[PDB]
């Protein structure tokens, strides 16, 4: 499946040293691949250990195409939302003090930079400070037609993000989303022709016309900054969740026109892994991966 890489050392100062180890856990069933790069920053001029965790990998769309022989009613499954959560599940000396992205972002390309200044000063910036900075990382991911937003339960011991369908353009029509509704046509999200004479299965817009996130996948890139307050315990635990909410989109003919309906999160697939972060020897250990699913 996957494993942990030996710790790599990168001295920067008499004060600052950087240790890197990478963990990889896969759910082949759900086609979700997590890749966690832990960057331990030991700075002697700061009274707090810092861990800048960068989560990359892949979350499959889950997209189930429609059967082209369906005549009056047809349905499809698409990837409507991708949620990523990082959670420190132990030790009151560990708290999530920062992360990226930190704001709502509807740009086709979410790009941020993490800078660590000698002394424990961290700062995230929208884009791509040198000299003054001891360590820096970047996040870079495409989310065309979708938007990123922080989860609502983000606090001192948890941070999460949601990349949801936002402004999807059918063609010259739209934008549409998971909750669009027209008095007559319903949710026209993936509806091709309103009065089309075609079979239901052949009245959805072309897959290639669909956003990459809707029918292909999402390659996340998020950063979690955690700080250990040199006391209580040298160990802690952290859980990283990658999830996809699969929506059921269906349309049907009533004799005069086509009408669409989108059932939000009608099928959920979730991959969750747990690690033991050894803050003294700067190593992580895999405790448990749990694949789970919900079906309406």
UniProtKB/Swiss-Prot annotation:
Residue runs in coiled coils: none
GO MF annotation list: toxin activity
InterPro entries linked: Bi-component_toxin_staph, Leukocidin/Hemolysin_toxin, Leukocidin/porin_MspA_sf
UniProt entry keywords in alphabetical sequence: Cytolysis, Hemolysis, Signal, Toxin, Virulence
Lineage top rank: taxon: Bacteria
GO BP of this protein: cytolysis in another organism
Record keyword Phosphoprotein present: no
Annotated GO CC locations: extracellular region
Family: Belongs to the aerolysin family.
Biological role: Toxin that seems to act by forming pores in the membrane of the cell. Has a hemolytic and a leucotoxic activity. Promotes host AMFR-mediated inflammation by mediating 'Lys-27'-linked ubiquitination of TAB3, TAK1-TAB3 complex formation and phosphorylation of TAK1/MAP3K7. In turn, activates host NF-kappa-B signaling pathway.
Subunit structure: Toxicity requires sequential binding and synergistic association of a class S and a class F component which form heterooligomeric complexes. HlgB (class F) associates with either hlgA thus forming an AB toxin or with hlgC thus forming a CB toxin. Interacts with host AMFR.
Annotated protein name in UniProt: Gamma-hemolysin component B
Gene that specifies this protein: hlgB
